[PDB]
């Protein structure tokens, strides 16, 4: 009934008051500022042992470790400067989807097809590697669980639910719900306050730890979201798509500012990141390669090739010098 | 120096792991609710034929939709997919589903082994007369004569129908579309048979067979 | 963890005997051994090595030639066979363990010990100076450990370690390539040093800290300890 038609005017007042602060755009301020150039890199490394195909990596705080996870059931942890091996775990489950690395060095987080996100003990002192803690209250798969510091992690699942947990307890203490479709991706914000999501339904969400509601939605792609990422100085978000596109968004003014889309690309982006100094944006695609955009002009400029298979993960380092890809053929390269 | 030598010994053991990963013959296991799919065949399952090790999985733990997680399964041997066919109402949904995973992108290269259950059912349950043309699934009866095979001695024509009903139309849909890289596995079965472990033992050789003889430029 | 040794008597000369090292509670296949013997009044030296999956074997040369070394990881023993005995051979023995990745601690536990009586220039040289200094409770203490040739490698880190034995059990550690700290040792003791010269030093000493100082160098494969210093009143 009238519960219809007043969503409707509700929406066309929010439309209207965004054209009022639209007065002019990003394209043509920055106009004066010279071109990146060319950008020429080449791989350094070459990791390999894994059994089957790889799905999740994750950098450490440090800067030379860092970990990855394979379908075939391992967990292998690398040192990248020397390519040795320092550990080994074997899982129960084969089916895993996600990986992290606890910024104090001590936990590692996992999941995936069996709806929980365990945890593992490094620091043991009788010279192995056990399990700690099992969270369970989950409906569908996980897709990204995420550590906040040594006793609380945040997950996202397949079931348009996110949480937050108490490792020392195994109880979880606040919900967040919302979204429409499987929730695929998060990403928190430099301050440790807040973080964003992308769905299934093709849109994004803005939540608060504290208290726990959404603040703004935004909306402007076609298809399912599939990547998601935070700029250096937490004001701004990109992401990317199905419909083969990448798009930038603005929390202050709360719309667009700029599109980055080609003529000769048809394929879907399933990882997006962004360089230390924030000019730089890095995504992979289906067709085997990786491109390199122009950020404040929206212009190509480089390119990534010598893999096997698509390309399914991407990091770039704490102190920005080295970028890190995954991918089908179960090898890890180290551009520059 | 000495941390090289135990980055070595990590390696001894995973080349151990290779060997018996390789001969293993992992399964996906897909149908439908109301279709038997249990008392043909708990997620995961283990036997073993002639010194051969298989494992199958069952994947219902989830929603209705699954459009995310069905890429993980893009290098099992084979997938195995059960039918119901007794009803008919519910028989033009099952057709479509076979037509999504038979033409996606990231399943072009699996073979898929069919298995028509509910036989014994369809014998005497619709022989009596409660069904007909033009109300129900109008595909089984477009004037269609097959003569290529009649077994089981002794019976009138219209036995097997109501199970050869549906043969034909996941062949139509089969034969239309992948060139040579992967092919289809029809079965008859019922709720009673002692002898399907058999069955996939022999159709997952043929798999591999194939495979061999036309990369040698013989097939 | 614990680790426990049997054998040891009296023996006449040219005789021999076997001594075995037993442990219990960890995992024991992934760790090295060594041996290490101590005079009635002297101080610590190095005897032997034991690696993990017995791939590398190595030997003092005033024990080479009559000393063998062996493991059996799935009984979790040790062994040494010691053959044409001399008046040299008087000492204590203990079992330490070992582990080497990338980060790790060694020489963090070490055995309870066994009593056996019976009746060349390219080795770096550690010397401590220092033999008794007075102590009293809450002031500060200076100790150094200097060496005749550069500790520090050319990848970044040095190796020094520092040692504790009280008056009556075993020796343990407490710190680790000059500036880390053991875990469970409180936040009192802090290690600096340059290349040569290394100093170790307390702010407030309880009464819970008299004994004997040690350090070592792992830089070459011929291990060699110090002399020692007391901490006395």
């Known amino acids: 009934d009238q519960l219809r038609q007043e969503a409707e005017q509700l929406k066309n007042q929010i439309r209207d008051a965004r054209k009022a602060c639209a007065d002019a755009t990003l394209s043509q301020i920055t106009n004066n500022i010279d071109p990146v150039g060319r950008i020429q890199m080449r791989t350094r490394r070459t990791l390999r042992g894994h059994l089957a195909k790889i799905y999740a990596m994750h950098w450490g705080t440090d800067s030379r470790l860092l970990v990855s996870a394979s379908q075939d059931g391992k967990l292998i942890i690398w040192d990248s400067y020397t390519t040795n091996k320092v550990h080994a775990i074997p899982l129960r489950s084969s089916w895993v989807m996600t990986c992290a690395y606890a910024p104090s060095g001590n936990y590692v987080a996992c999941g995936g097809l069996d709806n929980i996100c365990s945890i593992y003990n490094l620091k043991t002192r009788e010279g192995n590697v056990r399990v700690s803690r099992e969270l369970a209250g989950h409906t569908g798969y996980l897709s990204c669980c995420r550590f906040l510091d040594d006793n609380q992690i945040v997950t996202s699942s397949g079931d348009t639910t996110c949480a937050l947990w108490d490792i020392e307890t195994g109880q979880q203490t606040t919900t967040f719900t919302g979204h429409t479709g499987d929730v695929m991706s998060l990403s928190l914000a430099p301050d440790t306050r807040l973080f964003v999501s992308g769905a299934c339904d093709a849109s994004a969400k803005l939540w608060d730890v504290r208290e726990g509601m959404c603040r703004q939605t935004f909306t402007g792609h076609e298809s399912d979201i599939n990547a998601i990422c935070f700029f250096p100085n937490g004001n701004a978000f990109a992401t990317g798509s199905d419909d083969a596109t990448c798009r930038l968004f603005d929390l202050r003014a709360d719309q667009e500012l700029m599109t980055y889309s080609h003529d000769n690309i048809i394929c879907g982006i399933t990882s997006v990141s962004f360089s230390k100094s924030g000019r730089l944006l890095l995504a992979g695609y289906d067709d085997f390669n990786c491109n390199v955009w122009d950020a404040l002009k929206a212009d190509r400029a480089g390119v990534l090739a010598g893999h096997d298979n698509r390309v399914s993960c991407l990091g770039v380092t704490d102190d920005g010098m080295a970028v890190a890809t995954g991918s089908w053929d179960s090898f890890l390269k180290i551009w520059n | 120096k000495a941390a090289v030598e135990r980055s070595k010994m990590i390696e001894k053991q995973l080349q151990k792991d290779k060997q018996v990963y390789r001969a293993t013959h992992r399964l996906l296991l897909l149908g439908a609710d109301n279709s038997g799919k249990s008392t043909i065949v708990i997620f995961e399952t283990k036997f073993q034929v002639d010194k051969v090790n298989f494992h199958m999985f069952d994947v219902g733990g989830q929603r209705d939709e699954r459009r995310k997680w069905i890429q993980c399964f893009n290098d099992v041997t084979a997938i195995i997919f059960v039918v119901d066919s007794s009803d008919y109402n519910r028989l033009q949904e099952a057709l479509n589903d076979f037509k999504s995973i038979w033409n996606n992108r990231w399943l072009r290269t699996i073979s898929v082994i069919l298995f028509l259950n509910k036989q014994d059912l369809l014998a005497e349950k619709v022989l009596a007369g409660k069904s007909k043309i033009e109300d129900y699934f109008p595909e089984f009866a477009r004037y269609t004569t097959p003569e290529d095979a009649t077994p089981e001695p002794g019976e009138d024509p219209r036995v097997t129908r109501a199970k050869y009903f549906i043969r034909d139309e996941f062949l139509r849909i089969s034969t239309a579309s992948g060139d040579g890289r992967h092919y289809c596995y029809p079965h008859f079965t019922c709720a009673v048979d002692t002898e399907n472990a058999r069955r996939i033992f022999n159709d997952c050789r043929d798999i591999i067979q194939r495979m061999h003889l036309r990369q040698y430029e013989l097939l | 963890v614990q680790l426990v040794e049997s054998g040891g008597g009296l023996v006449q000369p040219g005789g021999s005997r076997k001594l075995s090292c037993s442990a219990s509670?960890?995992?024991?296949?992934?760790?090295?051994m060594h041996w290490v013997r101590q005079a009635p009044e002297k101080g610590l030296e190095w005897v032997a090595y034991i690696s993990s999956g017995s791939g590398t074997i190595y030997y003092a040369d005033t024990v080479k030639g009559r000393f063998t070394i062996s493991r059996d990881d799935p009984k979790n023993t040790l062994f040494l066979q010691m053959t044409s005995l001399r008046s040299e051979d008087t000492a204590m023995y203990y079992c330490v363990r070992s582990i080497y990745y990338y980060g790790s601690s060694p020489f963090d536990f070490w055995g309870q010990g066994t009593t056996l009586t019976v009746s060349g220039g390219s080795d770096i040289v550690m010397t401590q100076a220092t033999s008794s200094v007075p102590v009293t409770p809450g002031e500060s203490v200076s100790i150094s450990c200097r060496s005749s040739?550069?500790?520090?490698?050319?990848?970044?880190?040095?190796?020094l370690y520092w040692f504790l034995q009280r008056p009556g059990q075993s020796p343990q550690l407490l710190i680790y390539?000059?500036?880390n700290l053991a875990s469970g040792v409180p936040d009192r003791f802090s290690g600096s040093g340059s290349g040569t010269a290394f100093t170790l030093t307390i702010s407030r000493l309880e009464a819970e800290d008299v004994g004997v100082y040690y350090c070592?160098?792992?830089?070459?494969?011929?291990?060699?300890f110090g002399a020692g210093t007391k901490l006395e009143l």
């Open positions: 509670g960890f995992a024991f296949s992934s760790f090295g």
């Open positions: 070592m160098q792992h830089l070459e494969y011929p291990l060699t």
């Open positions: 390539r000059m500036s």
């Open positions: 040739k550069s500790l520090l490698h050319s990848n970044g880190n040095t190796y």
